[PDB]
Amino acid sequence: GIVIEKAGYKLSIDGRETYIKGVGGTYRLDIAAQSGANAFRTWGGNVEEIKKNLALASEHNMYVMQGIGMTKDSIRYYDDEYKNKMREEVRLLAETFKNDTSLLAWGIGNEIELGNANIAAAWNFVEELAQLIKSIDKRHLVSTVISYNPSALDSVAKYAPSLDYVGINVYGPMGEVQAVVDRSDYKGAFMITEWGPTGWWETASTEWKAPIEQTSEEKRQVYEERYTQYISANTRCLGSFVFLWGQKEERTPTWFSMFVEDKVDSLPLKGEKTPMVEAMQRVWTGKELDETAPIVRGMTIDGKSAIDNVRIKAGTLFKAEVSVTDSLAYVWEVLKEATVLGFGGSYEPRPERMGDVAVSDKNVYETMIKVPGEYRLYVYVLDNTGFVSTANIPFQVID
Amino acid sequence: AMGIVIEKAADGYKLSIDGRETYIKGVGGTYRLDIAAQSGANAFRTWGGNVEEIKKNLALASEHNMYVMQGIGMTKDSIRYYDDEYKNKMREEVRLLAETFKNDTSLLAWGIGNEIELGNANIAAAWNFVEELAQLIKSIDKRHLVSTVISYNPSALDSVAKYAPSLDYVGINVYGPMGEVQAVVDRSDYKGAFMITEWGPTGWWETASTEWKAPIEQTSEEKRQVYEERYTQYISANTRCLGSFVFLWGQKEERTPTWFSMFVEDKVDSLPLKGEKTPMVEAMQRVWTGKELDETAPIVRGMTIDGKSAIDNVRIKAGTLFKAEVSVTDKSLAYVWEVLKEATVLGFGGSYEPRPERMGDVAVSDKNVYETMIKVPGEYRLYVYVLDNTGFVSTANIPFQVID
């Protein structure tokens, strides 16, 4: 009894109206569950990998939106060999998992429209696979996931009426999502299957084009505001999967990472949770928190902020300070400004460290850089409860 | 001396195929390999495939007289490198590949993983398994080279040196500036030969930007110069470098439709482009062949709106006509004009980006000028495509803001 009904729309699971409070992927689902998440999304997996996902979900009392990988090689959608292989794969998945009560929904493809070409053969095949799944599995929802793409919503409406809902991946500003969906030919409910904080293309940047990263306090506000204004306020939206519930290099080690790094050499961080995790507990539970992270109000070098275009003479001492609203510990690290960025790929190497990491008991740090260049000073503020708060400041060293 | 061998040279290293010294003049992927071969390319690189997909790649390569660096897909789920179930599955798959293709004359090299170090964790278990897979391949396949591909990563070069001495070479994927590649490899613990398994033109993080943060895109003439300069200074000049795979030999949305695309778009609704080659393809023919070209693309010198350039922060009042002009070095050109919104949905821990929305309709003209108006305030980019009648297209664009 997984049903989407007109109210916009409401989702019910065996009579029980449920909002999908999700994370992208399977990192620290213990913390997701402790934070009041009830779901996670995966992109793919064979039978054995999906059984593992659904056992993890069961341990955490969470629902799964389980992805099925579709090709971006557009010519394959005319190929009966490819289509026969995919029908055999989807038959097996539907037959195996139709009675699993952790599984919520099948995701048939992720952004199939951003393939070699957006073509009717691909959309027709999504609709064929949806019919195939619904002929075997009467329990679960069937969906596809698209980019934030008016054409793709129109395509779903035209070619895939058998879908129960559409997932939309939203990167960057979210203020127009409601209007974009409302204006499209698509009638029905949706989920925001990827969303997150302010992009490095949305923020201010220094004169040398370093994007100015929000403090963890600013990021907390952005996660809560985006959730409240653009997810839970949209009556056509049934829920969402937040990113990045984990850590990955993305312009900086902290940019969209809701956890800090773990097991980086000579960096004594252990993957602590952040105010961005606090933000999601607050909006998922709708309740105030007992434990909150240190509130970072800002950060300076020689009294100047990121927006001031901080320039330091090579070989001169500079003094940093982080302002926090008192068993606190401070971890300080200088990296080069990132120069190897995802350029048609997802993965970026960690920028090179200058000198050594420092730990202090006070909110101040002084050092010296001999090499002219573009740098970033990162501070991590550790309480003794497993929270870490963050800020960084880009600066230039000059001869 | 039959098969593929890397030898110490007086300076650096050299690669021989059946005793003939051969430079690897490669493209990433399998798009328009007819044009790659016509341009002087002798190689392409793939990331994965089953036996049947690899047979198709090697048949395409044979038809074009090209060599393949064939990838084997390795996991970024780092805990799996401890799991005998994952490792026995990969050993079986790699044994089958090595046995199936050991005598193929189109295959050059196996690429054991792409950026394994950028998975969940960079760990000994992963590098030791790459070494184990390399020894397994070389136990069966005496003809081909074995490699791994890393990000542009001093730490990864040190890990290959410590854990994977059975590799013949390392592939490095290089995005952004290339001037430090030589010193980075030289300063590393890695001692052997390398290939640049991804390289391309100027990143949108490297260029000037407008006052509203729109990256200023090079003209196709500036991109031509960048591809030629990077190849000549950093690839062919590096005596430890055995060759390279250029990107993007194809088209993909990356901030703009044109940013790193060496071909323009094909079958976009109400846009009459047909995947024409560009001055960036001409650049690779010039450096691959070392010979001057019979046919060259139109040389775009610049682009204006109302006499102003991209660097001038062009601002136009809503509901007013403006006049664009594209300057071309004079030599029956056609001009295709399109206004898109400045991209706001970018790759954010993903690769794929939707095409930004079109304002109004595409225009085609016989003259190098175009007039239109935008009624909605916002950030836009005007694109021009300059078609000769030989199958080349040249490009420029200009970001502009429409204000109340």
Numbering used by the authors:
A (entry chain B): 25 to 31, 34 to 351, 356 to 429
B (entry chain A): 23 to 353, 357 to 429
Publication text:
BuGH158 consists of an N-terminal (α/β)8 TIM barrel domain and a C-terminal, eight-stranded immunoglobulin (Ig)-like domain in contact with helices α7 and α8 of the TIM barrel. Additional loops contribute to the extensive contact between domains, with one from the Ig-like domain extending above the TIM barrel to shape the active-site cleft. A Dali structure similarity search returned members of clan GH-A as the top 20 structural homologs, confirming the bioinformatics prediction that GH158 constitutes an evolutionarily distinct family within this clan. Clan GH-A members present the conserved catalytic acid/base and nucleophile residues on loops immediately following strands β4 and β7, corresponding to E137 and E220, respectively, in BuGH158. Additionally, a conserved asparagine (N136) precedes the general acid/base (E137) and is anticipated to engage in hydrogen-bonding interactions with the substrate. Indeed, site-directed mutation of N136, E137, or E220 to alanine completely abolished catalytic activity (data not shown). The active-site cleft surrounding the catalytic sidechains is rich in surface-exposed aromatic residues oriented to engage in stacking interactions with the substrate. Crucially, this superposition also reveals that 6-OH of the glucosyl residue in the −1 subsite is oriented toward a pocket lined with aromatic residues that may accommodate a single β(1,6)-linked glucose branch in BuGH158. This structural feature provides a plausible explanation for the strict LdLam specificity and poor activity on yBG, the latter of which contains longer β(1,6)-linked glucose branches.
Through a systems-based approach, here we show that the symbiont Bacteroides uniformis deploys a single, exemplar polysaccharide utilization locus (PUL) to access yeast β(1,3)-glucan, brown seaweed β(1,3)-glucan (laminarin), and cereal mixed-linkage β(1,3)/β(1,4)-glucan. As exemplified by the β(1,3)-glucan utilization loci (1,3GULs) elucidated here, PULs encode concerted molecular systems of surface glycan binding proteins (SGBPs), carbohydrate-active enzymes (CAZymes), TonB-dependent transporters (TBDTs), and sensor/regulators to recognize, capture, import, and saccharify individual substrates. Whereas BuGH158 is a highly specific laminarinase, BuGH16 is a generalist endo-β(1,3)-glucanase that can accommodate backbone β(1,4)-glucosyl linkages (as in MLG) and long/frequent β(1,6)-glucosyl branches (as in EbLam and yBG).
